[PDB]
Amino acid sequence: TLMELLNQMDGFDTLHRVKMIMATNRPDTLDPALLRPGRLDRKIHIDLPNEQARLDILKIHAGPITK
Amino acid sequence: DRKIEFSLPDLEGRTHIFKIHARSMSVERDIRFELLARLCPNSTGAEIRSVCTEAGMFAIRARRKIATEKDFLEAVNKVIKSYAKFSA
Amino acid sequence: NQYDNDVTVWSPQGRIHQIEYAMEAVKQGSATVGLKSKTHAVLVALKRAQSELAAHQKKILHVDNHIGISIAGLTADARLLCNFMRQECLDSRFVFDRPLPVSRLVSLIGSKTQIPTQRYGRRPYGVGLLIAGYDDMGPHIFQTCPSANYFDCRAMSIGARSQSARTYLERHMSEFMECNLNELVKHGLRALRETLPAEQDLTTKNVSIGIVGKDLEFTIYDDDDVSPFLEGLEERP
Amino acid sequence: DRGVNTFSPEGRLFQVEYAIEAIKLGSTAIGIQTSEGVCLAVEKRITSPLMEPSSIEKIVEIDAHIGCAMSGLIADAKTLIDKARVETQNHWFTYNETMTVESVTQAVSNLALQSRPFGVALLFGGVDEKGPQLFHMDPSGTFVQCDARAIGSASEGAQSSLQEVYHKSMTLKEAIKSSLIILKQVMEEKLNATNIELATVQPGQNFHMFTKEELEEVIKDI
Amino acid sequence: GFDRHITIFSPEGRLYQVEYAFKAINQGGLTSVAVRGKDCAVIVTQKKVPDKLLDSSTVTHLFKITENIGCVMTGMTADSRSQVQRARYEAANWKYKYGYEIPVDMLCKRIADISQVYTQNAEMRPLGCCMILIGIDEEQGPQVYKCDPAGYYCGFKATAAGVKQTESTSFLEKKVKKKFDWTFEQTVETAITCLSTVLSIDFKPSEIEVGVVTVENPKFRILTEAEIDAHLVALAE
Amino acid sequence: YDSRTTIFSPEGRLYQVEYAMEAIGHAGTCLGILANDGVLLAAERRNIHKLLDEVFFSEKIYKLNEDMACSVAGITSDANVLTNELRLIAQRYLLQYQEPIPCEQLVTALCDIKQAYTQFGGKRPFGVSLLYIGWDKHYGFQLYQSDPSGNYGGWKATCIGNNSAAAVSMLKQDYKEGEMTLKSALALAIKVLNKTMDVSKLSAEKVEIATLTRENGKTVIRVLKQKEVEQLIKKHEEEEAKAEREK
Amino acid sequence: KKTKGPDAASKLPLVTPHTQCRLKLLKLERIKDYLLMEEEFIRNQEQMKPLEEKQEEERSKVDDLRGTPMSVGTLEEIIDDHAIVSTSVGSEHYVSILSFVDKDLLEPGCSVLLNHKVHAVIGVLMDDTDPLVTVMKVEKAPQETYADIGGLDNQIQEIKESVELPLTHPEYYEEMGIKPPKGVILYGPPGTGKTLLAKAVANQTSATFLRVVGSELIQKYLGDGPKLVRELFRVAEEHAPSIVFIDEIDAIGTKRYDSNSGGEREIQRTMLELLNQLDGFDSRGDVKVIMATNRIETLDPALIRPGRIDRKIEFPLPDEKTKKRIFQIHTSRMTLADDVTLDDLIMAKDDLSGADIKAICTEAGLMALRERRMKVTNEDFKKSKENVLYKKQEGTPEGL
Amino acid sequence: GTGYDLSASTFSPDGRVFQVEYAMKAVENSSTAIGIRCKDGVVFGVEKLVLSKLYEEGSNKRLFNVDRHVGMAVAGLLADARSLADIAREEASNFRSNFGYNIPLKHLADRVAMYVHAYTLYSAVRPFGCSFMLGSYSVNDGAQLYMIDPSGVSYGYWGCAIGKARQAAKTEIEKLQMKEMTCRDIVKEVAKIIYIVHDEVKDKAFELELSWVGELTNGRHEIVPKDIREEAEKYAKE
Amino acid sequence: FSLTTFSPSGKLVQIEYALAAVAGGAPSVGIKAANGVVLATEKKQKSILYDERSVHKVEPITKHIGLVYSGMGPDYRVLVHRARKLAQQYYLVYQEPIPTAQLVQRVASVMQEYTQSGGVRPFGVSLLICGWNEGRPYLFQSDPSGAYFAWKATAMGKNYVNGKTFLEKRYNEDLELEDAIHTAILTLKESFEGQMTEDNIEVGICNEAGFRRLTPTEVKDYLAAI
Ligand SMILES: Nc1ncnc2c1ncn2[C@@H]1O[C@H](COP(=O)(O)OP(=O)(O)O)[C@@H](O)[C@H]1O
């Protein structure tokens, strides 16, 4: 079924302003045949937030809270 | 709630059903209807009414409207129709 | 339901349906109980009577001096199992002059009955067996279901409404090892009497007893032989 | 369902529940086991006078001390009776004595279901060391000791009547008349000697035909 | 009906049971590649090992049928092992009946005949496992053959079986159409790059198991981890 | 599981056997006519495609024994095995008794095997009916017709093919016992074959005929070759022309 | 929606000779003279009017208020003063009719008029002539009588007694307090069965008649095969108490089919609805259900029981005298011959039924009319035998 | 399936054998099992549901001894499981009679798996409703452990589980570090894993049948001494 | 049941389906010339991965009996193996008759284990047989249910109808020499889609000297100048 969206890549990519973001849980079992050129290709690493990201997101979470 | 059932007439149930049905018709209880009640094991109340129905039909067939003392004919028609219900 | 038609076919939900129906053959039968002791094994079978004129049929079948069985279910392929068990015990007697231990016999029965559960055109042996034996490890009681999965048991009952007898045996099974012969037989009689409706009660003509012990070879007691055990019934129907 | 071996979904395999209800199409037969002996009464039910009554026989002597009364498909009963005779003769030849009626009934029951099941019920009766005995064997390879048994199309009514007309200390003379009056009440026609067969069992006699048209001495009282 | 349920000819004039049995090979999630070369014949299949509690020592799909013939199986593993056992029995029986070793083509012919008997009749069913067997044959060079659940035994030079067998066959057709013989380096590298292009994991030298039969060195070498790693390093260079 | 049909009907009929017997009428055409000093069979060559070579020398007519010959009209797959079994039975009798097998006994054996095939087991009935012509010491020239039902019949002028009703009607109309001879029997056979085959002026290739004759203490079964058959055709044509023109 | 039909036809079927003679001539002249006199009577009564009284009080008050334009719609409900009428295209009006109101003929679900403008019902069309959903009373009280069939005296007496237990002497078992609607289960060879109809016309001489033949193995999810017949016998009780002749469906539709479950749902529904209706403890009415078949073996045990379905009657094959009588009846209309060749055609005959007798009689006339046309064709003496062979009895290859 | 899932000889339209796909469901439904290859041996363990206290001490035990050094821990339909255990015993006896010595575990597992595949191939017979581990040890070949599904084939297992909860057991099995832990602590740990798997959360009380094979027993696959492994069960309880 | 079966009223439905299957797609023409018989067939392998010298469509059953076939090659293998065993048994029983054409009719007749004992599922291959050990050639066809037909020229492929039409229009004839193989190749050409080559076309010839499967050299030689 992912290969179906793969061959959709000729869905007028020049004409169509459509992209597809794959928000998997773990990139472990992702059918490595789907990471070749012409496939989904790019992958960006997101993990549990570090201490800096954690304190920043705590700040923005506390933003609406005024006590 | 309270799911209950019966439809399992024993000797006492069958003979009481005989009594209430024999309340109808021109029959009386001098007949030994207990004998026929023993003869049909678990014959509902539906078949007892049928057997009383048949006894009436035999009396009219004999052209005698009497059935109070028509007990031997009562027993005869009841037993032969019990034979035919079991095997016809 | 298609998948319930044949023994060979397997239900999509799991276990097959013909064997599950085979256990209903033993459910639809006269009740029988069987309990172990420290030294004796006793079977109490309800001899189901057709009519008062006819006899109460035969239960608690005889196999050998130290082994006796009680059937509960399809009587046709039950004398066949009795013949098989008798033949195996006699074969053991003939080959090495010793009583065939009950566990090995039960394993043989299970293996023999397993094949019809897999061979097409062969119905499973829908017979419930309560084997009472006395091997060298004291008395033994085994239950064989048509599913060919036998069980060992301190006290087990099979038949119609046998669940009440099972519950009574379970509640009184703690005081089973230390019981005299008559005490254990009366335990079994009370267990079986609790099975039938309150209208029914134990009679010398409708009950059978199978006792096997260390010094007592398997014996089938009935009316005159049962009356000494039937005394002191403590009747609470 | 329809398979002769497949069990029913509820409790008990079919096609044997179908073979058992073949005594229904079969003809009525009654036997009484008394202390005097065993009385076996059947009805021939001749359909046309041209057929010889001697040809139609429901009671056949398996041996000198065993008599058998069939109720059902006489074709299958021929095979079962032949096997009973063969087994009795084999036992006598092996052990030089008279095979018990219980043992013969057990052998017939073993051979009953081993081929579609036989659809006949037999009423074995004979003398043994345990007095006169009677056994009711049924198409589904099951045998039961009985004292006064009825079988056939009207088994229910005949057995119900026998249940109250029988008593534990009767003789042959009362048993024959009770069986005959019952038979007359069961059948459609009368109990003429050409239509009713009777078999007697005695401790000191072989089981012979009931006097062969001189048995009217037992139907005139009826 | 039952045209598509039993091994009988369809009204349209086809045999649907074997047509299904071939898709059974695709079922199971595996692929295999066979490449005949100038002098050698090398075969490689992926080793799908879920979790390491399994023994990678014995999860293999390639076997030695005799001292010079090696097979790779594709499809259901039970039928695969049954056919491997049958092939080994046939090889031994041939060596017993006839002195010389069984030619690989004759062994494939016998296995295909067994499979054809299976698709004949109706009591049994075809085995859902396609076998690619290779071996060096004198006066013939390397030889590769494929026996299928039908009984059609053929296949040469470059032949593949499994889920993505069509893509591998297409790439190998491109390679063989490129007219250049493969030595005992190019044949292995061609097979490795074929299977890698089919399933791009770059093939860490632990997830494939390659079998090799050369001419100067007979026997079915199941190349070890070091050999496959060396070939992978040489190829990715 | 699938079970074959070798059973009765609610009325009590063996409709499988009946359907096979009716199907025998469909396809094939043979006829046997019995005359004094000679018995003959006529067969209709169904497929006359020019791409055959006719090297088997016989398709419908089969020589089964020294003193007899048959002609099938059913499915050729069963026809071949039935002819082989018939020859085997005849030769087994010859071995056992050192004497040619009487035709009736041979036909009874074959119909017994067909009755067994339709009687027991899950086996198809032999969808083939065949005639037999032969000579013996007891009854002389004999003709027999056996259907797949296994119920053979001793005939003297019969047909077994597609238009078997029309052929037997033509036989009944123009059959005369006693006066019948070999030559007049040939004339009648060719006439009835011309009647049952719509195309007039039947070619000698589309008709295969074999005559059994009694020579000096020896039975000769001669299949009439093309030239003799077409000479018979020419004589028949002369007779037709004379009869039509004389009116 | 249907109660009765105007029976002003079938003018004296008792033309005694049924053949051209002076007596039959004279009977027809009396018939025609009466028709002339009746027409003259009614015409003179309607023309020489009793009195001329205005516009018969019609055009003065009701006709004008009814108006010229009208439309028809069904009448749905009734209330004390108004009426609830479902007119065309799903319109619904609550109006009190007072002009030309006939409440008895109005009825729910009947066609009434609407005077437009001020839409008020002004009349009803009692004819309507569209009660066509389920029509089984169209053949009610068939004209066939006892005399049409002879030689079946024992069966005629038996069925007559079984159906003249009601009507005649109902107080007999009213005092015996049973009221059994047992019906009659009829046997008979397959060569008969429309006589199971002919012997039914004996009872059809009284009250009406309903027929359910072939019906279906009620695959319908609602079932309602026997249940709708139950409604129709209720309609029969509303009418003169009719009988229900279910020949061939008491056999197939109620088969002693010996499988239990997964069996076309008729065994679940049809048999269980049949015994509910056949039990007098559930439904009243003098309706007598005649269950006739040609397969006694397939009698279901519920149908077997005389306790609910009594009065089992067997129809045998005709005897020599019965064959003589039926042949006489069928050839009486055609004047077979002047030699009266009667017994030669039946003396050696066996297993010949009523349908065969009718067929051979018809074919004898057909063969005579073919070319042997000679009024009472002298050939009929043997041609009756020629077409009594007619082959066509049974044919099944050889098997012998 | 519907139409194609009636006999094992009928292939699916996609090419599958639904009879075995359903026979696996019986194994999935029956009570679980576990077997771990310790450093110098193989340790089994199976919880058995005491369906009623009427039964005696642990009977119809899921553990079996198929040969002197080989043991079988089975789950699924127990009667067919016992018949297959008898088949394995006969196979081991035949191999010992023919080739002498003791049957290697890989070959025994292969032969019994081929027999099971023979039973799933045909139509008249039905696939076996059981899955079992065969565990053995010898000085020459170390410790081996092969698991056979109701239709599949033997596979080498460092540690395996089958029955009601395969994944739940396997997670903690892979959490456990085998290949360096002696069979004693492995006996403690297999009971720990079984008690971690649900026993009475939805079911009755369970009995702990544990088995041994290893150099500590010089081969000779035997049931662990239950009196001294009750303390191991206690450690599992904690 | 376990034989050639499924024959309804006036039909052989299973056999008819087998004949629908043997329609196949391999033309496999056969021509009976005066000097001998030619059995030519088309080997159109899928892609170039397969080999042509590995498997063969023409099989010499014995010294001068050659065999070609139609659809269902796996069945054809078992059938030709059975035919080889049957011919060998006949030659062993009747020792040293050099039995080919006095055996070609006999081997065709013994092709009754071919179909008259079908084996639950009937064979799905129709096969042409050639023999020339009688001073005269023989071409026979055995079909999935029938028997010997004794053809002079026929085809058994996807376009066997127009192939047979081509054979008769091109006048298979009777005076044609052994080199009617040119006409056989032409008949294949009609039922062929491609530039047929030596490995693409396999042909065997059976003349009075014996039977021989023509090697790709001679096949290409004949295909040249066509
Ligand atoms: N005994 C008879 N006397 C007069 N008419 C009869 C007799 N029997 C049948 N018929 C007439 O012949 C017709 C066919 O009768 P029947 O045999 O009942 O038909 P079927 O055989 O089609 O059921 C009936 O409609 C009936 O009117």
Q: Does C197 contact H at CB distance below 8 Å?
A: no
Measured from the CA of G358, which atom of ligand 1 is nearest? 12
Residue carrying the six token digits 């029938």: I146
Pocket test for ligand 1, best of G145, G146, G194, G213 (most atoms within 8 A of CB): G194
Q: What angle do the packed helices E16-26 and E104-119 form, to 10 degrees?
A: 120
Contact yes or no for G181/G287 (Cβ under 8 A): yes
Q: Are the C-beta atoms of residues G364 and G320 closer than 8 Å to each other?
A: no
Is G225 among the annotated ligand-binding positions? no
Residue with tokens 């499994």: E162
Tokens of I2: 């376990």
- Cα E183 from Cα E189, distance rounded (Å): 10
For residue A64, what are its two tokens? 């609406």
- Report the CATH number at residue E198: 3.60.20.10
Find out whether the beta carbon of G192 lies less than 6 Å from any atom of ligand 1: yes
Question: Is B88–G305 a contact, with Cβ atoms under 8 angstroms apart?
Answer: yes
CA distance H90 to H74: 17
Contact C208, C42 (CB under 8 A): no
CB contact under 8 A, F56 and I150: yes
Domain spans in chain F, listed from the N-terminal domain onward: 1-245
E121's torsion region: left (phi>0), alpha (psi -120 to 50) or beta?
Answer: left
Q: Are E190 and E197 in contact (CB under 8 A)?
A: no
Number of domains in chain E: 1
Nearest CA to ligand 1 atom 8: G354
Does residue G192 have a known ligand-binding role?
A: yes
I162 — phi, psi (to 5°)?
A: -70, -25
Is residue F11 a contact partner of residue F115, using CB atoms and an 8 Å limit?
A: no
> How far, in Å, CA of E197 to CA of E204, rounded?
14
In angstroms, the CA F141 to CA F185 distance is: 14
Q: Which chains touch D (3 or more CB pairs under 8 A)?
A: B, C
Going by alpha carbons, the residue nearest to atom 13 of ligand 1 is G355
The reply to whether H1 touches chain C by the CB within 8 Å rule is yes
For an interface test with C, give the residue of D4, D5, D7 to mutate (most C CBs within 10 A): D7
Closest C-alpha among F208, F173, F210 to residue F192: F173
| Residue G271, number of CB atoms within 10 A of its CB | 20
Per the entry, the structure determination technique was cryo-EM
Range of H66's domain?
1-238
Q: Is residue G189 a known part of a binding site?
A: yes
Helix axes F182-196, F226-245, angle to 10 degrees: 80
Rounded Cα distance, H89 and I65, in Å: 54
Nearest CA in chain B to D21: B87
Closest chain I C-alpha to E235 CA, distance in angstroms: 23
User: Annotation-wise, does A25 bind a ligand?
Assistant: yes
What are the Cα distances from residue E27, in Å, to B1, C59, E76, H15, H120? Answer: 53, 55, 8, 7, 17
Please report, for the domain that includes residue H31, its CATH number: 3.60.20.10
**Interface list for E 177-206 with I (CB within 8 A):** 177
Of the candidate CATH numbers 3.40.50.880, 2.40.50.140, 3.30.70.360, 3.60.20.10, the domain formed by D1-222 belongs to 3.60.20.10
Chain F residues whose CB is inside 8 A of the G398 CB are: 21, 147, 149, 151
Contact at 8 Å (CB) between G152 and B31? Answer: no
Chain G residue nearest residue F13, CA to CA? G396
Q: For chain D, what is the HEC assignment? A: CCCCCCCCCCCCCCCCHHHHCCCCCCCCEEEEECCCCEEEEEECCCCCCCCCCCCCCCEEEEECCEEEEEEECHHHHHHHHHHHHHHHHHHHHHHCCCCCHHHHHHHHHHHHCCCCCCCEEEEEEEEECCEEEEEEEECCCEEEEECEEEECCCHHHHHHHHHHHCCCCCCHHHHHHHHHHHHHHHCCCCCCCCCEEEEEEECCECCCECCCCCCHHHHCCC
Cβ count near B83 (within 10 Å): 18
Which ligand 1 atom minimizes the distance to the CA of G190? Answer: 21
Q: Is the CB of G195 under 6 A from ligand 1?
A: yes
Shortest CA gap H142–chain E (Å): 14
Question: From ligand 1's centre to the CA of G206, what distance in Å?
Answer: 20
| DSSP type of residue B64 | -
Helix (H, G, I), strand (E, B) or coil at F2: coil
Cβ–Cβ below 8 Å for C118 and H52: no
Q: Tell me the CB-side half-sphere exposure of residue E192, using CA atoms within 13 A.
A: 28
Query: For B77, what's the count of Cα atoms within 13 Å in the CB-facing half-sphere?
Result: 23
Minimum Cα–Cα distance from B64: chain G residue? G172
Architecture of domain F1-245: 4-Layer Sandwich (3.60)
Residues of A in contact with E201 (CB under 8 A): 32
Q: What share of chain H is helix, strand, coil (3-state, %, to 5)?
A: 40, 25, 35
Nearest by Cα to C45 from C233, C220, C207: C207
Is the CB of G254 inside a 6 Å radius of any atom of ligand 1?
Answer: no
Q: Do the Cβ atoms of H157 and H133 come closer than 8 Å?
A: yes
The β-bridge partners of D124 are: D68, D135
Handedness of CA D193, D194, D200, D204 (dihedral sign): positive
Token output for D131: 């007095």
CA angle G272, G275, G281 (to 5 degrees): 125
Q: Is any Cβ of chain G less than 8 angstroms from the Cβ of B56?
A: yes
Task: In whole angstroms, give the CA distance from residue I199 to residue I208.
Answer: 26
Question: Which run of H or E residues covers position C17?
Answer: helix C17-27
Cβ G358 under 6 angstroms from ligand 1: yes
Contact H134, H71 (CB under 8 A): yes
SS3 label, residue G378:
coil
Q: Is G188 annotated as a binding residue?
A: yes
Name the CA dihedral angle for I188, I191, I195, I196, rounded to a multiple of 10 degrees.
Answer: -30
Residue H196 in tokens: 């971690």
Rounded-to-integer distance, Cα A32 and Cα B3, Å? 63
Chain E: partners with 3+ C-beta pairs within 8 Å: A, H, I
Asked whether C72 and C27 are in contact (CB, 8 A), the reply is: no
Which H residues 25-84 touch E at CB under 8 Å? none
Q: Among residues 367-396 of chain G, which lie with CB inside 8 Å of chain F?
A: 396
Structural contact between residues C40 and C211, judged by C-beta atoms closer than 8 angstroms: yes
Is C28–D12 a contact, with Cβ atoms under 8 angstroms apart?
Answer: yes
Three-state DSSP state, E233: helix
Instruction: Tell me E103's DSSP state.
Output: P
User: Ligand 1 center to residue G394 CA distance, Å?
Assistant: 19
Any ligand 1 atom below 6 A from CB of G150: yes
What does each C-alpha distance from B47 to B32, B84, I54 come to in angstroms?
18, 13, 85
Give the Cβ contact number of residue C94 at 10 Å: 8
For residue G354 and ligand 1, the question of a CB distance below 6 A is answered with: yes
Q: Do I77 and E113 touch (CB under 8 A)?
A: yes
Residue nearest to atom 2 of ligand 1 (CA): G149
I48 neighbors I90 (Cβ within 8 angstroms)? no
Is the shortest distance between the CB of G152 and ligand 1 below 6 Å? Answer: yes
**Residue with tokens 């026993």, as numbered in its chain:** H199
Which residue in E12, E117, E158 is closest to I49 by CB distance?
Answer: E158
**Stretch (H or E) spanning E43:** strand E41-46
Q: Which amino acid is at G54?
A: K
C85's tokens? 């068990």
Residue F151 CB-density burial (10 A; 0-12 exposed, 13-18 middle, 19+ buried): middle
Edge-to-edge order in the sheet of strand F68-72: F61-65, F68-72, F130-136, F140-146, F153-155
Contact D146 C53 (CB under 8 A): yes
Of I60, I27, I37, nearest to I140 by C-alpha is I37
Which of D156, D164, D186 to substitute to test the interface with B, most B CBs within 10 Å? D156
Using most ligand atoms within 8 A of CB, pick from G201, G315, G358 the residue to mutate for ligand 1: G358
Distance in angstroms (rounded) separating the CA atoms of residues C7 and C118: 7
Taking the CA atoms of B60, B64, B70 and B73 in sequence, report the sign of the dihedral they define.
Answer: negative
Q: Could you give phi then psi for residue F139, rounded to 5 degrees?
A: -115, 0
- Between chain C and chain I, are at least 3 CB pairs below 8 A? no
Number of H helices, E strands in chain G: 12, 10
Nearest 5°: phi and psi at H168? -60, -40
Question: Distance between CA A25 and CA A29 in Å, rounded?
Answer: 10
Q: Who contacts C89 (Cβ-Cβ below 8 Å, separation ≥6)? A: C63, C64, C67, C99, C100, C105
- DSSP 3-state assignment of E172? helix
Instruction: DSSP letter for H55, please.
Output: B
What CA–CA distance (Å, rounded) separates E90 from E108? 10
**Which tokens go with C73?**
């279910």
Rounded to whole angstroms, the Cα distance separating C167 from C145 reads 19
**Checking DSSP bridges between strand I29-32 and strand H70-76, what pairing results, if any?**
unpaired
3-state secondary structure chain A: CHHHHHHHHHCCCCCCCCCCCCCCCCCCCCCHHHCCCCCCCCCCCCCCCCHHHHHHHHHHHHCCCCC
The DSSP H or E segment spanning F185 is helix F182-196
At H34 the three-state DSSP class reads strand
Cβ(G142) to ligand 1 under 6 A? no
**Judged by CB atoms within 8 Å, which residues 9-48 of D form the interface with B?**
24
Chain B residues whose CB is inside 8 A of the D24 CB are: 87
Alpha carbons E72 and E35: distance in angstroms, whole number: 12
Q: How far apart are CA G261 and CA G264, in angstroms?
A: 9
- Whether chain B has a CB inside 8 Å of the CB on D187: the answer is no
Q: Selecting from 3.90.660.10, 3.60.20.10, 3.40.50.620, 3.20.20.60, what CATH number does the domain I1-226 have?
A: 3.60.20.10
Distance CA G244, CA G237 (A): 12
Please report all neighbours of I, defined by 3+ CB atom pairs within 8 A.
E, F
Distance linking the first and last C-alpha atoms of chain G? 61
What is the sign of the dihedral through the CA atoms of I210, I213, I217 and I220? positive
Q: Do strands E31-36 and D66-72 pair parallel, antiparallel, or not at all (unpaired)?
A: unpaired
- 3+ Cβ–Cβ pairs closer than 8 Å linking D and I: no
Place of tokens 């495609």: F49
Separation in Å, CA of C225 to nearest CA in chain H = 28
CB E203 within 8 A of CB E195: yes
